[PDB]
Design a protein around this ligand. Sequence first.
Ligand SMILES: CN[C@@H]1CCc2c(ccc(O)c2O)[C@H]1O
Length: 288
Amino acid sequence: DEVWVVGMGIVMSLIVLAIVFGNVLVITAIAKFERLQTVTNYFITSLACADLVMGLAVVPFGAAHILTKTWTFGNFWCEFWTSIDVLCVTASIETLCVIAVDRYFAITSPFKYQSLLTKNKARVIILMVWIVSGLTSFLPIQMHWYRATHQEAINCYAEETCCDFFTNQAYAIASSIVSFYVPLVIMVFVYSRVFQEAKRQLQKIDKSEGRFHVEHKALKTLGIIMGTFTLCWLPFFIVNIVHVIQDNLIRKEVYILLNWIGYVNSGFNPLIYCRSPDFRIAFQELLC
Ligand SMILES: CN[C@@H]1CCc2c(ccc(O)c2O)[C@H]1O
């Protein structure tokens, strides 16, 4: 049989449909209803836009390349596609970091939260995030600064029917540091402090109203948030660092598999973040 030819296509199409439907529903729900327009919901809008772009562009052409085993399009479109991939991934991760910092400021400083965050300052931050995303994905790739120098890489670059990722040590390390590790450290610190604050509040409530009946929730929420992200993206950004240092340690198929596992995070974000009752009411009004 040829269960590989037809089997993988079904799964890839399902992934594309799930990503597109979820992100479109979130975006149109925020846009149509005036109640949902909040300074917290603009970051979710940027995240959903990045996920929608990735689902429409990065995934279908990668699936076609995998199934056909050749890059039938031009040589220019290979670099265009790589640039869009890197852009979307880094923009999404930094938007997640921005949301985490927003929550940190909301709980930690209750009185001064209103002054720090304003609709004017919630746009400058998003524009800066997207600009920083664009200055690491288009500028180095299109200027041919990431290109490797060895016989297989040179032969891949010369041929017009081969689109594979070969990169330098410097670009790999700098891209990984910019895209993954700094947001990871920021999120770890932020969520640790938020957990401390929640524990202090529970202690105070128990000490005050203990005689009447009157950390499972905090643990469950933080576990979902930080386990649907580290598990999805961490394994890839270790082999990314390793594969340049050691020539034959990491195979080429494991790289692509871990990369595609990383992409799946786009279709999960509406589930993780758009769970408020207002969002459910808006979804119920739109559909059904
Ligand atoms: C071909 N796929 C790319 C390869 C390297 C890379 C990705 C994402 C973010 C980065 O910072 C990267 O360096 C992947 O999406």
